[PDB]
């Protein structure tokens, strides 16, 4: 029953601002400090800052400058703002609750990935990867999403909305030209495949797309 | 501020075999209320961190006991028995003694494990793509081991060299192996030009590549 919802923009232009709102379920404002931590392939993992439970803020002091921190303790809001965003600021946004000493609402949110470009939205279209007997070896089956052509990232995608885990390959993204493309994968019994339907479920938040993509035999 | 140094980057261990990462904070990190705030992180791709370790040597809720902390002012270790497949991903060291709170660099876990012989599987362009006027050629290399793979594309007898698009995952969750995607990115009308298409792993578990093909029409 512990969460941290994350609500903010894919995509920033330069020098503008980014907004996010973490809300949390589960435990008090007016009781725990929640933290704002990036994660950029670049510099791994930067702690931004923490708005503690009587609303005092300490902020990392790389940041200081252009950054602010404050919370609505009746609504469990926490809200980060970061001022005139350039290229590299460019990552994954969370807020969390880290740095426990006795309770246990050690939790991170799903993350906000922030893309600071002049570029436009684009959704991915979603093709299917239907097998055919071409794509089977022994008595598995792979089946396959083919994810093409959005911006920015992320997208997810799971299979069978998450039930289907074990034998899942997600491919991580790569540019083609301007527009992304990924594939996952799932393998599967060739006995599941005559009476199962198998769906890939595609998600690009940036768009507010969530594509249901029914894979089935060639 | 603490920089947090972590080794090794990678680390090798045995499917069953005990993994050691190692953090080392530059100067001491015990917070003013005399509690030390180190953490263990571990990162799934594509998944949010979460909380093994923390206070140096507590574990979470959930946690197998596997999994242990240890070490003192400077110098800590996380320990994990009997590493399994479930364990794979990047683990983070963390102190938050000190403001700015800081990160190690991450050290990722990889498992070593028996050989296996890629599956192969190839997928026409759907007819979805094929109405937008783009056509790729998709064909999985499945949960095989080591790493190291080669992929040799054919239309119509003829090799295709260049222009093949190849990501690859980390290691499986499951069973601890490598699963690589290959794609022949053409034109609806490039694609139509030929009939037959093949893709061929060459892997040295087999000195014979396996092999997928389709045909058109
Ligand atoms: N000797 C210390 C002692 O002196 P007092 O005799 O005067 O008590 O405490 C002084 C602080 O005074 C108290 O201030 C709090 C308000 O605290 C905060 C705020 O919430 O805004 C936070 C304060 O920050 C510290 C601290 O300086 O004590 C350091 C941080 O690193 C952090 O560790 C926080 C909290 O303890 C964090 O709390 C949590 C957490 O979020 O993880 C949550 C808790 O539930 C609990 O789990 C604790 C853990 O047990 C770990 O401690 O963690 O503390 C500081 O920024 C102050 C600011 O100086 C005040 O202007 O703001 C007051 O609480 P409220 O009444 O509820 O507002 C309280 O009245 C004060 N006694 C300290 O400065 C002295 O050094
Ligand atoms: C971003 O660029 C600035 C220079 O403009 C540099 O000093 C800073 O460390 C960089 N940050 C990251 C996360 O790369």
């Known amino acids: 029953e512990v969460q941290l919802q994350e609500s903010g923009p894919g995509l920033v232009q330069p020098s503008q601002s980014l907004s996010i709102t973490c809300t949390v379920s589960?435990?008090?404002?007016?009781?725990?400090?929640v933290h704002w931590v990036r994660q950029s392939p670049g510099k791994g993992l930067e702690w931004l800052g923490v708005?503690?439970?009587?609303?005092?803020?300490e902020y990392n002091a790389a940041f200081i400058s252009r950054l602010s921190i404050s919370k609505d303790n009746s609504k469990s809001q926490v809200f980060f703002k970061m001022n005139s965003l350039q290229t590299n600021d460019t990552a994954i946004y969370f807020c969390?609750?880290?740095?426990?000493?006795?309770?246990?609402?050690?939790?991170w949110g799903q993350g906000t990935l922030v893309t600071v470009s002049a570029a436009k939205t684009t959704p991915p279209s979603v093709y299917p990867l239907a097998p055919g007997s071409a794509a089977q070896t022994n008595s598995m089956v792979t089946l396959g999403c083919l994810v093409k052509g959005y911006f920015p990232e992320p997208v997810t995608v799971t299979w069978n909305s998450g039930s289907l885990s074990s034998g899942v390959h997600t491919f991580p993204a790569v540019l083609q030209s301007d527009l992304y493309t990924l594939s996952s994968s799932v393998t599967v019994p060739s006995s599941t495949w005559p009476s199962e339907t198998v769906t890939c479920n595609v998600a690009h938040p940036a768009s507010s797309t969530k594509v249901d993509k029914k894979i089935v035999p060639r | 501020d603490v920089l947090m140094t972590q080794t090794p980057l990678s680390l090798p261990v045995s499917l069953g075999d005990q993994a050691s990462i190692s953090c080392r904070s530059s100067?001491?990190?015990?917070?003013?209320?005399?509690?030390?705030?180190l953490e263990w992180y571990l990162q799934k791709p594509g998944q949010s961190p979460k909380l093994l370790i923390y206070?140096?040597?507590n574990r979470f809720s959930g946690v197998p006991d596997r999994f242990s902390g240890s070490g003192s002012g400077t110098d800590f270790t996380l320990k994990i028995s009997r590493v399994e497949a479930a364990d794979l991903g990047v683990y983070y060291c963390?102190?938050?003694?000190?403001?700015?709170?800081?990160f190690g660099g991450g050290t990722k876990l990889e498992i070593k494990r028996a050989d296996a012989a890629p599956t192969v599987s190839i997928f026409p362009p759907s007819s979805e793509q094929l109405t937008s006027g783009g056509a790729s050629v998709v064909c999985f290399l499945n949960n095989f081991y080591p790493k190291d793979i080669n992929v040799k594309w054919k239309i119509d007898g003829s090799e295709r060299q260049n222009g093949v698009l190849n990501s690859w995952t980390d290691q499986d969750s499951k069973d601890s192996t490598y699963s690589m995607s290959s794609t022949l990115t053409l034109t609806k009308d490039e694609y139509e030009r030929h009939n037959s298409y093949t893709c061929e792993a060459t892997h040295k578990t087999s000195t014979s590549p396996i092999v997928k093909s389709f045909n058109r029409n």
């Open positions: 969390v609750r880290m740095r426990i000493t006795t309770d246990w609402f050690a939790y």
């Open positions: 589960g435990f008090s404002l007016t009781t725990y400090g």
């Open positions: 708005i503690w439970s009587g609303g005092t803020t």
């Open positions: 100067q001491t990190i015990v917070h003013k209320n005399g509690n030390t705030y």
């Open positions: 206070k140096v040597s």
């Open positions: 963390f102190q938050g003694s000190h403001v700015p709170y800081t």
